[PDB]
Every structure is written in structure tokens, then in C-alpha cells.
Amino acid sequence: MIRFEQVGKRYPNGHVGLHEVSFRVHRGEILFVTGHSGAGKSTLLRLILAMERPTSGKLLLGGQDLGRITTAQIPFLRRQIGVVFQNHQLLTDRTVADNIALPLQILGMPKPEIAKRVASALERVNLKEKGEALPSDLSTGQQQRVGIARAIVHQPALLLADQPTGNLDPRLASEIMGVFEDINRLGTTVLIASHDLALIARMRHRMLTLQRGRIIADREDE
């Protein structure tokens, strides 16, 4: 229900970020993407994020296609999915607790269970002692996993994320994608992408590989 068809984005500047793509994804499936440096992956998932337009073809998400969408409907779809970025974005001068809690206020729930849930999210990342601190204080991997937790909370119906543990301990990433699988245990579809091929050979996998805008450098290979 995440089908793609003949899509490709060319910049007005002249560059062709995406040449041509067409495929489908089923509900509740784990996904992986790899490729070289110049491959368009962050752009690829940004298409789903829709800060831009397809520039070619069409993509359909459930009932409504992503292209030609009212701006008023944009929050009503962007508030259902948690994400994380290579250049993580965090609210400076606001501590970790509210930084994580943001989506809860976005939907709007009483504070007590909100603090309960943020506490619950804290242990799954092992940042118990960092409960009240400015993001500028944290060490490099710490804010990355903080953003990860930001995506974790509110049990999003779907997860996208970006390359996690890009600067993390190899051992410490183990429990991380373990938690990712635990999330996948429910009706949650994950679209993680990375370069560490070593650990993408363990569980169920799909290895969608992009090469210079070319959709098929690889296939299912499940």
C-alpha cells in the first residue's frame, strides 16, 4: 500500500536527484536500503516526507496520492510518523524531557502519563541519568539516540528514520535494531536505511539498492 510508479525528481538547477522508480511495499514489513554515496536515499524517503514534489510520475499512500495535497492536510499526515535525520534536529534551550515529549503535546494528553511514557522511553535507550539537560550538553551519540527516542514515543503507526548508529558503538547498536524489531513485532512498518552491510544479513531483509537514480541495483533478495 506504499506503491511507487514511474517517479523521479529533477531539480530546477538541472540535477536529476531521482531518475525512475516503481515498486510496492506491504503493511508491517521490515525494509532496508543501501547504495553508494551519490545514491538518492534521504531524497527518496523525503518524497514520502513530502517537503517537495515528485517532479515525475505519481505515488499513492492509502486513499490519497501524496502529490497534489492540501497544505492543511499536511500536519494530519506528518503527525502520524516518527523520523530521525542524519543532521538531527533538536530544540536548543529546551531540555531532553520536553524535547522527547513534543509529540504528546502535539496530540495533547495529560502531563502525568506523559511523564510516565517519557520515563518508559528513557530506559529502552539507556539514558536514565540524562533526564534534565540541555541538548548542547550531550555527547555526540547521545543526541542521536535522543532523536531516536523522539521517534520511538507515542507508538507511531509507522517509522521511517535514517541511518541510525552512524556514530555509535557497534555493540550498542545491537540492542538498538533489536528494539527496532520489537517495534516491528506490532503493526509498524520500518523503512530504515544504512551502509553497515554487516548487520543487515541477520533478520528478514529486502536490500533495495539504488545506483545513481536507478531503482534496481538489487531486488528483493529476501
Partner: protein
Amino acid sequence: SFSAYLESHRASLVDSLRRLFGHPFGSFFTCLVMGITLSLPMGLSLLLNNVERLGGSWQRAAQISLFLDLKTSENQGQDLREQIERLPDVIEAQLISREPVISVTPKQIDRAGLEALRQQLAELPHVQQAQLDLVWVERLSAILKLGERFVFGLTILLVLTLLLVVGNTIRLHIENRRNEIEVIKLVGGTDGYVRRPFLYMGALYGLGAGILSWALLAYSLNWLNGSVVNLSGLYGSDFGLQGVPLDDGLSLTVGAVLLGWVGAWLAVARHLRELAPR
């Protein structure tokens, strides 16, 4: 989610206060500027209103010096006293004795051509010589409406400079700390949600500036009272410039608050439209 609607306002305000109380020197430095700017226009309104209280010096002179007949007759002058009261463009013809004449001040200034009324007045019981100098009317009418163009220009110029300064400062302040406007937006949230805190601290800046201007203006007028009371008693009168009425001061402050609020809309709209998916 009406209960949450209340909570958004509550959390937004308290956060702003912490943000406002934090970084205090910069916030005060900003607030002082538009406070002192807001002082000028309403201060001039107060000044002109105060001189409006002393509204007898405009007419003051230019009383028709209708010479009563050389033969002394106070009764006839007293009899003709009341007729002038009936007619417009005048106030009252007060009868005077030899140590005769009767005079009346106008209300407007008119110009040359309204002395036909003076010639018409020189047809009454006591008419020895109608006396109403013209050239004074000319000079006075030249001075006025010249003052009116002058005040018009100052008013419009100063209103424009105030509007520009407040709008520009709010715009630049909103342009800074941009990261929030997107970091909240992509993960979700609505226009009002992101908009509210920016409304709040702008309202606080406006309130603080409106308060500061009150004290500045009151102190300035008290400083200047020294010469005005001196000349007031000196001329043989009692007219000293008075203090700030609270009724006007509250209207002063609320204007600043609403001005900050509308500036918040204007500044936020540019960025919100800019970051459109397009």
C-alpha cells in the same frame, strides 16, 4: 480538545516569561527602544490637548470696537448689550464706560469679508465709530491653517516612523531563532500551535514598552512644569501642565500590546509562506 486548547496557552505563556526573564539585558534593551518611540506621538497628543484647555487665547483679541456715541449713555449700551449675545460669530458685547465703547470677541477667525457684519453692527443705538482692524485678521489667518499643515505633517511623519520601527524590530527578532518554526512543523503541529508563543512574547514586549513610556512621559512633563507654572502665574493666571490621566494611559498601553500582536502575525507569515512545500 478544548481542555488541551487551554493548556497550550498556559504552557506557552510561562515558557515566554522564562525566555523573557532569561537574557534580561537584551530584552530590556529592546523594550526601551519602542517604549521611547511610543512616547512621542501620544505625548504630542497630550500637549495639544493641554493647550486646547487654554482655548481662549485664539480669539483673545480682535474685538469689534464699536464706539458708543460721544454723549455718555450707559443705559442705552446696557440695552444693546444683550442683542449681540443672540447673534452668532460672537460671544458677548460687554458694556464699558468712558474711563465709551462696547466690545465682543469672535469664536472663529474668518478673514477679510466678515467685517460686513461689523458694518452691519454699526447701525445700532450706540454707533459713533465702527472699529475692527483688518490686517490682524490677515496675519492670524495666515498663522493658522499653517499651524494645521505643520501639525498634520509632524503627526503623519511620526506615526509612520513608529510603525516602521516596531514592525522591523519584531520582524528581525522573529527571523532569528528560526529553527523551531520548521523543527516543530515537519513532525506535525498546526499553524496556531507554532504561532502562539510568538504572539505571546511580542505581546509582552509591547506591554513593557507601553509601561515604560508612561513613566518617561510623566517625568518629562513634571520636569517641564517649572517654567509653565512660572509663566502662568506671571501672566496673571493659573495654568500649569497637568499629569497623565490613567484613562488615556491604559489606552496607550493596549495599543502597544495589539501592535506587537499584529507585528507577530506579519513576521510569522513570511516564514510560514516561505517554508511551503511548493
